[model samples]
Target chain A: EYHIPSWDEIEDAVFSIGEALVKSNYIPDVLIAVLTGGIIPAKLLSDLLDLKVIRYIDIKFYSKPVIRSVYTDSLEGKKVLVVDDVADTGETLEAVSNVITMFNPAKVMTAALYLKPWSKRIPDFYYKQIDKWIIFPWDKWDVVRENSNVPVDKKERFLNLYNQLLKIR
Target chain B: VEYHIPSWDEIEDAVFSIGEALVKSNYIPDVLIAVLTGGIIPAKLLSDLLDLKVIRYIDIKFYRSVGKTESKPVIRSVYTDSLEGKKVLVVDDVADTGETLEAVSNVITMFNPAKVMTAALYLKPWSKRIPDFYYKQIDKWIIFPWDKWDVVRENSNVPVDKKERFLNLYNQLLKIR
Candidate 1:
């Protein structure tokens, strides 16, 4: 079964993750996000934390077993917070963590809005638990657009979930 | 001229300190005006912290080139209602020469906000103008929290260098955001 979260739910997750971090007293000096899917959530987190430094890395794990990514080497001696929209399989999250470590940050942490039960890795913080596939707001749009360029099979799969999301809403 | 500059670690507290002030005041600013470029990051962080739902930016350009400062600051754009009765907060990273901060504040005042408060993480001894709230005083060139020499690369037109440091930190920003 597939599950989808509404925009408000995502915002709730954003606030919860931030509050948890604050209570733990783990303040991040820099927020490095995994772009594509993580960007908006990263901005919400940055705003929630009132953070000053935000950087992003573009990464892709689909279509290939390996992650292809790009990032600046600017993060040395910084306490880094890594954010992504979801940790569906955890491969992308693991890739981002490995790259951040290469810069020798003083500390490293991660947050995901949704976590999967059978994922290979789990983030330090997550707001909601799901045992199904996700169709994020962005994905919802992608599945419906006529010229989306997403593979037909993928689009069909997402369209099915998008229809389910509307019913629940 | 020595300075107590910041690495990202130190900046975390400073960002919140300013946010805390605005939140505690229950100011609920009708709008947050970022001083542009430098101030945008700080402004963006604050925008989320306060949950104000409104954010606008003012682009003030005083730099002729790298080390060159324009004789007068220029007000590029502001697209919000006259801040006449609105609670307003202006945020920036530094108040170096203080010329731009003071000038921007004056421009904001023209809109005649109910009140205009200012905040910056760093201040300077010679700054003729002081913000309503500020964290530190520094008269020397600073290495800020976001600067990973990426800042140096931009300011280096007059004097620039790159040694075993950064490539394209050219990473994409956000359309997703």
Candidate 2:
């Protein structure tokens, strides 16, 4: 039920998404990367494409999903692409799309590297459809430390892996 | 002008090296303070590697989005953390002029952090200051992967020669298996 992807896999996924967006001839004027999870993907995508301007929409789910801040200029007549790492429930992507729509962008498109098979909303573009919980490289240690759903054996495995990671020089 | 394009794998290696250096030095930090735009990626990676949940950013703009010549760096956003007596590590992608890092270090001092150290992925030979923790030193114009295509595009404001310097190199390097 838990799927941990390597950095190489993430790079490949982003490359795939970048190629798809390029082949489709849909170059956006701005990238709105949902932060925390979306930062790395957006950064990689920025290099893959020549996109310079990137905006961030920080949405955290506590009791309910909340947008922490909306620090952006008006996107009037701008083609905007909203990127997230996952479309788990698709609520975050949907919420961000609705917010971007308010800024009057000419077009708004959504993308994520991974999508849950049973997600409520399907993004315009995605590289993989997976049902397991994806533990990205960035979230490996955090997941092992925080997630109760992670099996005890998996926690030990992660702890060992993390210990080895810390030994890097 | 020769340019150095650091790969994603290389960035990861530097971050881990920084993490290990921090551990070896026994200077464990409570928070990571990223100098934004450049520092964002390195700091985020450091956060995961170091397992430091408390991270903040300081956005200081020196170079315009499209050019090589840097204007006077200005602080656009400051930290919100009440960093009284907390150990912190300042992170960035490079120490080119070292001015950006120096400026940020000065700002962090005002917040009253206990011990403030700095780290970066790359350090230039001519930098005014050497980050307390850094990966390697090089003199080439280091074109970060995140910034490669942005600076040479038709819309970029950089000069013709500047654009020409970086235009073809990025994609060619990317094509390497």
TM-scores of all predicted structures: 0.46, 0.76
- Interface RMSD after interface superposition, model 1: 16.3
DockQ of each: 0.03, 0.33
Tell me, by lDDT, which candidate is best.
2
Name the regions of candidate 2 deviating beyond 4 angstroms.
A23-25, A144-169, B1-7, B24-26, B64-71, B76-86, B111-115, B139-145, B148-177
Give Cα-based local distance difference scores for all models: 0.66, 0.77
Summarize candidate 2's per-residue lDDT along A1-169 as a digit string, tens digits: 7887766688778777876776676788899988778878887787667676777776886645798776567899999999989998898899999999999999999999999988888999888998898888666657766764664333553455467656653
DockQ for candidate 2, C-alpha atoms: 0.33
* Candidate 2: residue A70 Cα off by (Å): 3.1
lDDT of 2 by residue, B1-177 (tens): 566767766877788778778776878788888787788888887787667777777768786465565565788767454898999899999998788888888988988989899898999898878899999898887777666566455345433333443444344434632
Give lDDT: candidate 2, residue B51.
79
For residue A166, give model 1's deviation from the true position in Å.
35
lDDT for model 1, on a 0 to 1 scale?
0.66
Segments of candidate 1 deviating more than 4 angstroms: A1-169, B1-5, B23-26, B64-70, B154-177
How many pairs collide in each candidate, listed in order?
A: 0, 0
